Amino acid sequence: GSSGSSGEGVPFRTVSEWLESIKMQQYTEHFMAAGYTAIEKVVQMTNDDVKRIGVRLPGHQKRIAYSLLGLKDQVNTVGIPISGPSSG
């Protein structure tokens, strides 16, 4: 352990900036009604939820589901993500 620069987490602050990123802002109206106005809850929802919110298509589903993975991953990471070319 060590004390220094801490923080970081979720990349987006609103569900709009998140959905719009994957061309799914049109579904935002549904996400809110379902109770996913905040990314904090948008990550809690399961794959099935993505089908209940309104999305019935295969693509629109994966498009969001795949995006959810990065959300839970971002909040998990204490700082910046790993990479190849980096000292240490």
- In whole angstroms, give the CA distance from residue 32 to residue 79: 29
CATH number at residue 46: 1.10.150.50
- In whole angstroms, give the CA distance from residue 51 to residue 61: 7
What is the rounded radius of gyration, in angstroms, for the C-alpha atoms of the chain?
15
What domain range is 55 assigned to?
Answer: 1-88
Residue given tokens 């295969």 in the structure block: 58
Total domains in the fold of the chain: 1
User: Using an 8 Å Cβ cutoff, are 34 and 53 in contact?
Assistant: yes
User: Using an 8 Å Cβ cutoff, are 43 and 66 in contact?
Assistant: no
- In whole angstroms, give the CA distance from residue 14 to residue 5: 24
Q: Which two tokens stand for residue 73?
A: 């991953």
User: Using an 8 Å Cβ cutoff, are 27 and 15 in contact?
Assistant: no
User: Using an 8 Å Cβ cutoff, are 34 and 66 in contact?
Assistant: no
What is the per-residue DSSP string for the chain? Answer: ---S------S-SSHHHHHHHTT-GGGHHHHHHHT-SSHHHHTTS-TTHHHHTT--SHHHHHHHHHHHHHHHHHHH-SSPPP-SS---
- In whole angstroms, give the CA distance from residue 62 to residue 55: 10
